[PDB]
Amino acid sequence: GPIRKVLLLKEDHEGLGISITGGKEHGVPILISEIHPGQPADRCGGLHVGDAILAVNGVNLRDTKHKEAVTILSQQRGEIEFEVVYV
């Protein structure tokens, strides 16, 4: 599908509210496998199960290993911009 930019707003006491799977070591992008109800990703409205996370706040995630992506994603705070695509 088309590449999309999506804004997520998160408070500091919360996580992102997604599960991710995949990563470079598996030969696939970082993929959203779950959107947890009522948490920030669900609330933002623009992120879906099956989306590949291409970048977050300008950080490319296209060639990142799973745990690299976890560290990068979990470091983001506040107003967080995602670049995503559904294939």
Partner: peptide, 8 residues
């Protein structure tokens, strides 16, 4: 399940 999954 071959791939890692993390809740974040």
């Amino acid at each position: 399940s071959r791939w890692q999954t993390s809740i974040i």
